[PDB]
Amino acid sequence: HHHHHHMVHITLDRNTANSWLIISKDRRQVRMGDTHQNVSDNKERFSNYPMVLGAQRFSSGKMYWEVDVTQKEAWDLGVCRDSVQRKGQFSLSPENGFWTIWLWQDSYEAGTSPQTTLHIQVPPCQIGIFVDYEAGVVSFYNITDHGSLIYTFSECVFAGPLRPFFNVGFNYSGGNAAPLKLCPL
Numbered sequence: 001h002h003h004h005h006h007m008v009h010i011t012l013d014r015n016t017a018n019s020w021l022i023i024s025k026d027r028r029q030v031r032m033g034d035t036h037q038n039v040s041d042n043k044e045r046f047s048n049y050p051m052v053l054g055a056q057r058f059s060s061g062k063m064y065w066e067v068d069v070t071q072k073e074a075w076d077l078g079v080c081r082d083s084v085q086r087k088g089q090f091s092l093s094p095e096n097g098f099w100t101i102w103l104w105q106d107s108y109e110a111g112t113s114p115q116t117t118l119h120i121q122v123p124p125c126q127i128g129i130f131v132d133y134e135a136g137v138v139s140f141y142n143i144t145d146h147g148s149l150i151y152t153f154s155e156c157v158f159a160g161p162l163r164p165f166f167n168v169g170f171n172y173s174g175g176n177a178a179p180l181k182l183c184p185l
């Protein structure tokens with residue numbers, strides 16, 4: 001791909017974070033803490049899952065960013081509507097306002113309903129995310145494998161402003177403590 005030149009500087013929005021997340025000073029890294037992180041509750045926080053949004057809102061144009069997933073066992077990445085549900089149980093689907101991929105139990109899947117199996121030969125350590133608002137496209141790239149395509153959502157019906165979306169995953173196994181990191185341009 002030649003999407004790198006639409007690079008945007010993403011930062012994480014603390015106010016949206018699940019109360020167990022720890023976001024770095026520079027707002028570019030996030031990990032699962034081993035307890036509640038001593039913050040007040042608010043209507044923006046994701047309650048049920050270790051999720052957080054980017055601060056940036058996109059309603060036009062082309063945007064690109066990269067995320068480091070090194071030595072994680074589980075995570076979700078992509079974009080979502082600004083108005084997605086925060087409280088309770090929900091599935092990651094375009095019907096619910098999410099355009100995402102994930103790693104879970106040694107398989108990669110796109111968050112369609114029902115989910116779609118991904119075919120990745122080189123497990124990625126960094127993922128590129130490209131959004132073309134006007135075209136209705138969200139694409140994912142394997143930066144570890146020379147930028148190879150992972151998945152494209154097309155004919156997207158965004159129906160609102162978009163925010164970068166992250167899930168660091170639970171750490172029941174003790175093998176998923178590593179952070180998500182926004183990579184430098």
Ligand SMILES: NC(=S)Nc1ccccc1OC(F)(F)F
Nearest residue numbers: 018019020046047048049050170
């Ligand atoms: N709120 C729920 S249902 N679970 C949850 C979410 C975020 C951090 C911790 C959580 O409970 C757990 F520790 F049991 F997983």
